[PDB]
Structures are given as C-alpha cells and as structure tokens.
Amino acid sequence: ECSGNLFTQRTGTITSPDYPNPYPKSSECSYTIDLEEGFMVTLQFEDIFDIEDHPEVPCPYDYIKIKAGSKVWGPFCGEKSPEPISTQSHSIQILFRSDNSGENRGWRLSYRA
Ligand SMILES: [Ca+2]
C-alpha cells in the first residue's frame, strides 16, 4: 500500500518503496504535491534510477509518470535518470506502478518550490 501520499511542504525527497532495495511487485504508488497557486515545483531524480524495461516496447512493465495540469512527463523506465523537470505548477501528481515480476532498485527524487 503506497497510494494517496499528500505533500504540502515546499521541499521534500520521495522514493519508491524500499529504495534502494527492490520495489515491491504489483505496486501502485501515488504522491501529490499540493502547494498554493503561484508556486512552481521543480523536480530532479537523484542517485540510482533503475526501473524494469523492455528492449523493444516502451515501459511495458513498470514506470513512473508525472502529471501537472495538462502536462505529462514519462512514463520513464530503465536505468537512465530522467532529466530535471520544471513543472511550472503548484499541483503535481507522481505515479508509480510495477508488475508482478523482476528485481529493480527504483527511484529517488527531490523537489523544491
Ligand atoms: Ca517489474
């Protein structure tokens, strides 16, 4: 269980469950950053980024996705750390799902506004 996290603080670090040890099978995580209008969240991945991937199909197993307003970043997977995100928004949703197999360390991100 890791759905429904709500952050109202302007700074924080968020990780996949158990990071940097493998995230659970069948995860459905969600994290909402809810700030006052006018604030603009910036997000950066840090340290190891390791989400299961596929050599031909883009992120079919596990992935993190970020949504703000109408804008979507990702899904992201694999070993490459996504580039930093300047969301231009005060209300951000961070979603992570995993399937029922594999072993991967997950992700860590920090945010600021
Ligand atoms: Ca998996």
UniProtKB/Swiss-Prot annotation:
<feature type="binding site">
    <location>
        <position position="52"/>
    </location>
    <ligand>
        <name>Ca(2+) 3</name>
    </ligand>
</feature>
<feature type="disulfide bond">
    <location>
        <begin position="59"/>
        <end position="77"/>
    </location>
</feature>
<feature type="domain" description="CUB 2">
    <location>
        <begin position="2"/>
        <end position="113"/>
    </location>
</feature>
<feature type="binding site">
    <location>
        <position position="101"/>
    </location>
    <ligand>
        <name>Ca(2+) 3</name>
    </ligand>
</feature>
<feature type="disulfide bond">
    <location>
        <begin position="2"/>
        <end position="29"/>
    </location>
</feature>
<protein>
    <recommendedName>
        <fullName>Mannan-binding lectin serine protease 1 heavy chain</fullName>
    </recommendedName>
</protein>
<feature type="binding site">
    <location>
        <position position="62"/>
    </location>
    <ligand>
        <name>Ca(2+) 3</name>
    </ligand>
</feature>
<feature type="binding site">
    <location>
        <position position="99"/>
    </location>
    <ligand>
        <name>Ca(2+) 3</name>
    </ligand>
</feature>
